[PDB]
Design an enzyme around this catalytic site. Structure first.
Site, PDB file in Angstrom:
ATOM      1  N   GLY A  82      -8.646  12.884  -3.630  1.00 22.14           N
ATOM      2  CA  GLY A  82      -7.810  13.902  -4.179  1.00 22.14           C
ATOM      3  C   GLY A  82      -7.738  13.911  -5.667  1.00 22.14           C
ATOM      4  CB  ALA A  83      -6.028  13.401  -8.164  1.00 20.85           C
ATOM      5  CG  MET A  84      -8.764   7.529 -10.334  1.00 19.34           C
ATOM      6  SD  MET A  84      -8.155   6.367  -9.053  1.00 19.34           S
ATOM      7  CE  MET A  84      -7.571   5.049 -10.114  1.00 19.34           C
ATOM      8  CD  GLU A  85      -4.041   5.490  -9.444  1.00 17.17           C
ATOM      9  OE1 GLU A  85      -4.615   6.449  -8.808  1.00 17.17           O
ATOM     10  OE2 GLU A  85      -3.906   4.358  -8.926  1.00 17.17           O
ATOM     11  CG  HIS A 131      -0.511   5.991  -8.996  1.00 21.23           C
ATOM     12  ND1 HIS A 131      -0.185   4.859  -8.277  1.00 21.23           N
ATOM     13  CD2 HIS A 131      -1.240   6.777  -8.170  1.00 21.23           C
ATOM     14  CE1 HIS A 131      -0.649   4.985  -7.034  1.00 21.23           C
ATOM     15  NE2 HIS A 131      -1.307   6.137  -6.985  1.00 21.23           N
ATOM     16  CG  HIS A 169       0.257  10.390  -5.599  1.00 18.04           C
ATOM     17  ND1 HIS A 169       0.948   9.804  -4.551  1.00 18.04           N
ATOM     18  CD2 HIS A 169      -0.811   9.572  -5.867  1.00 18.04           C
ATOM     19  CE1 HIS A 169       0.331   8.683  -4.203  1.00 18.04           C
ATOM     20  NE2 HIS A 169      -0.680   8.513  -5.017  1.00 18.04           N
ATOM     21  CD  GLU A 170      -3.401  10.808  -8.460  1.00 15.85           C
ATOM     22  OE1 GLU A 170      -3.419   9.599  -8.738  1.00 15.85           O
ATOM     23  OE2 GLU A 170      -3.692  11.128  -7.263  1.00 15.85           O
TER      24      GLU A 170
HETATM   25  C1  LIG Z   1     -12.993   6.451  -4.030  1.00 19.81           C
HETATM   26  O1  LIG Z   1     -12.314   7.224  -5.022  1.00 19.81           O
HETATM   27  C2  LIG Z   1     -10.906   7.072  -4.946  1.00 19.81           C
HETATM   28  C3  LIG Z   1     -10.190   6.061  -4.267  1.00 19.81           C
HETATM   29  C4  LIG Z   1      -8.840   6.165  -4.292  1.00 19.81           C
HETATM   30  C5  LIG Z   1      -8.173   7.241  -4.826  1.00 19.81           C
HETATM   31  C6  LIG Z   1      -6.704   7.471  -4.748  1.00 19.81           C
HETATM   32  C7  LIG Z   1      -5.842   7.450  -5.953  1.00 19.81           C
HETATM   33  N1  LIG Z   1      -5.615   6.117  -6.439  1.00 19.81           N
HETATM   34  C8  LIG Z   1      -4.477   7.908  -5.486  1.00 19.81           C
HETATM   35  O2  LIG Z   1      -3.720   7.202  -4.848  1.00 19.81           O
HETATM   36  O3  LIG Z   1      -4.256   9.114  -5.694  1.00 19.81           O
HETATM   37  C9  LIG Z   1      -8.882   8.163  -5.559  1.00 19.81           C
HETATM   38  C10 LIG Z   1     -10.262   8.101  -5.626  1.00 19.81           C
HETATM   39 ZN   LIG Z   2      -1.868   6.875  -5.169  1.00 17.34          ZN
END
Ligand SMILES: COc1ccc(C[C@H](N)C(=O)O)cc1
Ligand SMILES: [Zn+2]
EC number: 3.4.11.2
Length: 866
Positions: A257-260, A297, A293-294
């Site tokens: 979805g997205a990344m923090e 984080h 959410h992001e």
């Molecule tokens: C393999 O690529 C990813 C793995 C995990 C996430 C989730 C992000 N930390 C969250 O909790 O939104 C995002 C990308």
């Molecule tokens: Zn998360």
């Protein structure tokens, strides 16, 4: 591939304190120079073990000495005979263009971007790719200026220059030490939406949203939502942003979805881009939640990180809790709660009965990317919510504050978090900690007795958790079990015992226990497990009339919806049995009358009414059953819709018309009314065919927003109305160039009830808007078929299984992370009849035999075939 175990955690032999990176960026060949400052903490004879994947090593220097005491091994560079403190310099080459797995540094269209969580930084350079190694980063990016005018990393710009041959460079520095999973780099040409937020204390933060050229018209809601997230975290949690710039980049190619990443979040464009003609109300609220959410984080994940990946729920349960609280405060709390409980009961419980069952703090992992799960996320959040229920807001926030006080700037564990909550509140959470280590769904059985001589009401409550594939031993949990008791007028009976109030959150801590309540002056109708107070299955022998009573009287909106679900569950079960015997739908008149009453009740919130009028999904239905009959479930869902459409026809049409809105707004009262109107339209579509066709095609054509147009479209497909093919073609002709919009259409295609659905799906692999190179297109066509059309996926001929095997044979090599998400419906074979189970086993055995089987799939297949 060898598993890793939580109990094996040990502090690292070496730390890195500072890393200076330089990237000579090019899509075919990027050269990475990494200069790390390292300190040995272990024995002098222990080597430095760096992780690395698919790297071409150029050189290794220690204090500027070319080093000879090293060796490359599978996945690793092992460097011996080091001083206690030294500078490590590695130079290595990587190929972004070749990276179809979207892990590490990869291409998204013409942009270059990174994904480092969980273990992608080792695809960039040799490093201590473990989250308890935190370092201060400086990042210099060199690239062609025409192709990559924007060169982004975490933090702030510290240096900039231009070179010959049309190259330029930018250097970034981020003051906060971080684990490498929070590193990001982006390079590309973008439109940029720029705004500012001023924190409560007066820090001015530059907000910058990077989107592909020509997408600024779709960026303001995401920016709005960022600002709302920032404000809310200040109001509710007392937390302010800590840097000077907040960058978000929307990319079309992204597995999740997205990344923090600190200060430089990288988002799937699905969770950024919205305009009223392209995005539904749900899309808007999902963008809101994912932006939130992001952002959240930044404290729960970045400022305090995870010691090891088995502690993933430390950040993810807590950050999902925070996103839920954000959405719930800003919007409808009951609608949020209801949808989160739908997810728990209909998707998460299925995982917790599966071969992939795990506790929210796992004990064993082969591929960590497999553990970004409904369990860790959604059940993790229910675990945090239970701490909130046991402590109350004030003490929960005291715990949050002690958590940050203790752990800011460090990598922590789940146990650390629970300790902070215990210590701040003085509530004992020792037994509660078992929620972290035990998998499976507890079953809570409740019997009651009303003694009119003594005016006492007795609840006898038992618990057990069935064994799961991962754990043969189970023990009772600390289950916060909230109740409310209603008299005959619908008034709440005060809870008391021996002259003293009794808290309405009962502490159900034993296998069996009794709770006695005094001065109960009337036989109660109980509301049990209020607001889904613990993530459990409830067994209580409800009469129908107790349930319709609660639908009319219960004080909390959630309990009115939950009562409705219990009422329907009996009848869903009845009618699946009937389908198996070839008998038509049966529904008591009084059940239909209850849903009539909800339609005509002028007092009820339309947001609640719409959810009571949204039947459980096929996935929620399946959880009612030990053995799933997916054809019966799909056909009963349709027949129940058609029955209610006939029995309630006049009432549905009147409410449909009453809730017409000529202005479109993304505002919560307006969304509620629209969700109710469209819930009515869904039943109307399965009513008399000519009226249905007229109503649906008119809504489609006259809609002034995508919510309404898609609701019509979806109804035409689900009810196989005459206008379906025309409307489907109109949509394709209008929107084929817009993949995010086409994803809605692909979902409709994959979820069609039509008899030739699989032929249509296979043909859509060649569609102009489909490509196997894009995770969102895969999810929307193939994923939706396998996961959301379990009737077609489970066609008796085995054709659905074979299709998925062919797709997974591709995806195992192309993008194993996406493959691993897509295999999930085959790993649930033990829930199906023997014949289906044999076909699904044979499909799993074909995949087990693939050349170059990924770890990602190996883990799931081996558990499924055990
Ligand atoms: C393999 O690529 C990813 C793995 C995990 C996430 C989730 C992000 N930390 C969250 O909790 O939104 C995002 C990308
Ligand atoms: Zn998360």
């Amino acid at each position: 591939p060898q598993a890793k175990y939580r109990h094996d955690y040990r502090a690292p032999d070496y730390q890195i304190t500072d890393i200076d990176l330089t990237f000579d960026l090019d899509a075919q060949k990027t050269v990475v120079t990494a200069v790390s400052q390292a300190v040995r903490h272990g024995a002098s004879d222990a080597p430095l073990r760096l992780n690395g994947e698919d790297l071409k090593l150029v050189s290794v220097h220690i204090n500027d000495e070319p080093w000879t005491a090293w060796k490359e091994e599978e996945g690793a560079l092992v460097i011996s005979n080091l001083p206690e403190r030294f500078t490590l310099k590695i130079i290595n080459e990587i190929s972004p263009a070749a990276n179809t797995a979207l892990e590490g540094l990869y291409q998204s269209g013409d942009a270059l971007c990174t994904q480092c969580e969980a273990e992608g930084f080792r695809h960039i350079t040799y490093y201590l790719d473990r989250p308890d190694v935190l370092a201060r980063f400086t990042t210099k990016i060199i690239a062609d200026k025409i192709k990559y005018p924007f060169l982004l990393s975490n933090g702030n710009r510290v240096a900039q220059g231009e070179l010959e041959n049309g190259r330029h460079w930018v250097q970034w520095q981020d003051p906060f030490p971080k684990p490498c999973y929070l590193f990001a780099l982006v390079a590309g040409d973008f439109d940029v939406l720029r705004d500012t937020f001023t924190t409560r204390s007066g820090r001015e933060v530059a907000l910058e949203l990077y989107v592909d050229r020509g997408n600024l018209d779709r960026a303001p809601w995401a920016m709005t939502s960022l600002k709302n997230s920032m404000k809310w975290d200040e109001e509710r949690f007392g937390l302010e942003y800590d840097l000077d710039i907040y960058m978000i980049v929307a990319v079309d190619f992204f597995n999740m979805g997205a990344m923090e990443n600190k200060g430089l979040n990288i988002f799937n464009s699905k969770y950024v881009l919205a305009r009223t003609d392209t995005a539904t109300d749900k899309d808007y609220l999902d963008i809101e939640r994912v932006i939130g959410h992001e952002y959240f984080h930044n404290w729960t994940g970045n400022r305090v990180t995870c010691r090891d990946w088995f502690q993933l729920s430390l950040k993810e349960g807590l950050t999902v809790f925070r996103d839920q609280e954000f959405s719930s405060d800003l919007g409808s709390r009951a609608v949020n709660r209801i949808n989160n409980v739908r997810t728990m009961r209909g998707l998460q419980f299925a995982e917790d009965a599966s071969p992939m069952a795990h506790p929210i703090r796992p004990d064993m992992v082969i591929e960590m990317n497999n553990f970004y799960t409904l369990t860790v996320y959604e059940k993790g959040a229910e675990v945090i919510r239970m701490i909130h229920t046991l402590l109350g807001e004030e003490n929960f926030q005291k715990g949050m504050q002690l958590y940050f006080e203790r752990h800011d700037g460090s990598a922590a564990t789940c146990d650390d978090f629970v300790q902070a909550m215990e210590d701040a509140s003085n509530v004992d959470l020792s037994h509660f900690r078992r929620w972290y280590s035990q998998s499976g769904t507890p079953i809570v059985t409740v019997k009651d007795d009303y003694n009119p001589e003594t005016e006492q009401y007795t609840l006898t409550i038992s618990q057990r958790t069935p064994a799961t594939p991962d754990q043969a031993e189970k023990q009772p949990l600390h289950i916060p079990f909230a109740i409310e008791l209603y008299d005959n007028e619908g008034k709440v009976i005060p809870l008391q015992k021996g002259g003293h109030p009794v808290n309405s959150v009962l502490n159900v801590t034993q296998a069996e226990q009794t709770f006695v309540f005094d001065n109960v002056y009337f036989q109660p109708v109980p509301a049990l497990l209020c607001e889904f107070s613990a993530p459990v299955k409830l067994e209580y022998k409800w009469s129908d009339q107790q349930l319709t009573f609660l639908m009319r009287h219960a004080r909390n909106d959630f309990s009115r919806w939950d009562a409705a679900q219990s009422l329907l569950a009996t009848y869903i079960k009845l009618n699946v049995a009937r389908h198996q015997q070839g008998q038509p739908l049966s529904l008591p008149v009084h059940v239909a009358d209850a849903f009539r009453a909800v339609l005509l009740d002028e007092k009820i919130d339309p947001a609640l009414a719409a959810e009571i009028l949204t039947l459980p999904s096929v996935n929620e239905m399946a959880e009612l059953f030990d053995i799933i009959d997916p054809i019966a479930i799909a056909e009963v869902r349709e027949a129940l819709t058609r029955t209610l459409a006939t029995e309630l026809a006049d009432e549905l049409l009147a409410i449909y018309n009453a809730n017409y809105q000529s202005e479109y707004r993304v505002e919560h009262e307006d969304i509620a009314k629209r969700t109710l109107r469209n819930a009515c339209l869904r039943f109307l579509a399965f009513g008399e065919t000519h009226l249905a066709d007229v109503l649906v095609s008119k809504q489609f054509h006259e809609a002034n927003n995508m919510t309404d147009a898609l609701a019509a479209l979806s109804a035409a497909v689900a009810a196989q109305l005459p206008c379906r093919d025309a409307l489907m073609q109109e949509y394709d002709d209008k929107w084929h160039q817009n993949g995010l919009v086409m994803d809605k259409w692909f979902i409709l295609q994959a979820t069609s009830p039509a008899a030739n659905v699989l032929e249509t799906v296979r043909g859509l692999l060649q569609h102009r808007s489909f490509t196997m190179s894009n995770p969102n297109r895969i999810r929307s066509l193939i994923g939706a078929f396998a996961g959301s059309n379990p009737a077609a996926f489970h066609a008796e001929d085995g054709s659905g299984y074979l299709f998925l095997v062919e797709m997974l044979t591709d995806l195992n090599s192309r993008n194993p992370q996406v493959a691993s998400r897509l295999i999930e419906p085959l790993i649930r074979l033990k829930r199906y009849d023997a014949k289906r189970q044999e076909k699904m086993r044979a499909a799993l055995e074909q995949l087990k035999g693939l050349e170059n089987l990924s770890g990602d799939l190996y883990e799931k297949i081996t558990k499924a075939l055990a």
